[PDB]
Ligand binder design. Sequence first.
Ligand code: FKD
Length: 634
Amino acid sequence: MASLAPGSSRVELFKRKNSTVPFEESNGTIRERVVHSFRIPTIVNVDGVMVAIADARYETSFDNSFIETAVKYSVDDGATWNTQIAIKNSRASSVSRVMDATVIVKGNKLYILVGSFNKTRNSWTQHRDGSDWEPLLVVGEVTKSAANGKTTATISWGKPVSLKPLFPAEFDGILTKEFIGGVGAAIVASNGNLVYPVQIADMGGRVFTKIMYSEDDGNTWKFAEGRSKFGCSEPAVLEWEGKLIINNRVDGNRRLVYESSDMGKTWVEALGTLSHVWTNSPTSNQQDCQSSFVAVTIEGKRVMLFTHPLNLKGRWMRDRLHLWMTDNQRIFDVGQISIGDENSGYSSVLYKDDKLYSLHEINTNDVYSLVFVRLIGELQLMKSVVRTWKEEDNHLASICTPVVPATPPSKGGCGAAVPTAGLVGFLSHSANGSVWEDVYRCVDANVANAERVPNGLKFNGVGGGAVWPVARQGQTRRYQFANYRFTLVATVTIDELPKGTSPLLGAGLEGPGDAKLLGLSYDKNRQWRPLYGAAPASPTGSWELHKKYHVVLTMADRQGSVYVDGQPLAGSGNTVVRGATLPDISHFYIGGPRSKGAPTDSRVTVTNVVLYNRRLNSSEIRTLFLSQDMIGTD
Ligand SMILES: *[C@]1(C(=O)O)O[C@@H]([C@H](O)[C@H](O)CO)[C@H](O)[C@@H](O)[C@H]1F
């Protein structure tokens, strides 16, 4: 429940202990051979032909067993498939194996990078040296042919080539041991380069990721200078707005995401967007899982698709495969694409000719099949959401804001546009007694003791207010960016005087006590009480009951400011977080929500709460101050 959507369906395409593969004997005779388990799915489109790539783990599902690379391919979008063994293992031993295919499509060619092992019984990261290993590159060519109106295809697979001679003996003076591809679909960059994210094991047994790329269609390969932190594995890469985005598996902690604007030379952790959003299980202390990570264009908008199990059962069970869609600002949970509480695993997603598919593992008793899934209901919802995103951004960007003294007398006589770049969430008119709906359909705020008003809520009662969850999102922390930077905006009225001080808007911190990163309170003397981290919150300024004010909280570079009516309150611009440890914001609070502790009852009305993943600039703050009556969804 939350599960493969109505409209969608699947088949067991690579059927454990059932589907055969054309195993080639040493003498060249072909034998249709049953396969215990099919693992490590990738599905891609090569010039109209679906190509599904998988480990055929012939005898057992163990990693260090007899494995070859299987392919199934279809010219009729999966009505029918032909089956190959694309890549043979060395046949050196009973555990000879080509493993963990990583695939790039360029034109009618598939570039497949696999690890190849002869006799080791333990895993690649654990080997004493690289002697049992070769990284093999194989090129497949897809040829389509039509005759009597019947399209068919063949795929020819080149002889494997070892890239072992190209593997540096060290990086930063520490010796390398082995590398393999990051698993799954990799890319051709807009400059034509073949870009593989790779996993490197050093002679110390540590692992990290790097980009290995080719400028000449695989004739030569270069390892770019940058790398992940140690502990990152199975990286997936896409290209977004001129950067590589490298999304890493991280066993036992949250997933690190890096960006590189220079073909891997320099990596910067994506603290302001996607890093640490996703994780391996609710508690983050479990073995992680491979994920697909693909850029697609849906309804005219470029988005990234990401698949990962929730792994509520933990370990390698990997139940509850989800698909997320993000425009690098908003992050939408498309839903669970596996069925019920079944164990899934590694996955792949493909958008081809305006249809969405997945190829993913299902696991019963550690026997694995690959299901081929028609994500029909999922695509419908995705298109709806992208339309919402487009419609709202367009709407906001089209508002004619008031001219200001240095407006360049422009078109329509408007001031600067309402900012939409980095606009992550927006709470406005749509709400009920318990939910304040994110206009962008990703993260609702939870509400208590509220009454609806145009564009927001009026709070009256114990814990009257809204909680916009940050760390409180739980496993997938879509607002993790806020720990690095944010702007939070709202229009407010104070409806009744507080007894002493009462909360209005801010960012709470995880931990005991009642700590806030940045926020605003108000008091019985009709002063504001901005809260700048742990600093004693000194009253300042003046407000009137019933009057609408504009509130902006900005935090970036560990500095916090609080603006009322487009002007900073005393005490703004200083450091609100100390250390080089990111804050852990629990939630944004709007009004005085609480479920425990003091029975706060902030009698305020808040409308049009906007959240950005960056610090708005002075022009943008002014624009919002001047356009408060223009942005609401009522
Ligand atoms: C995958 C898995 O099922 O967890 O794990 C990797 C590997 O064991 C981990 O990345 C730890 O190094 C295997 O290579 C992969 O085939 C698959 F089993």
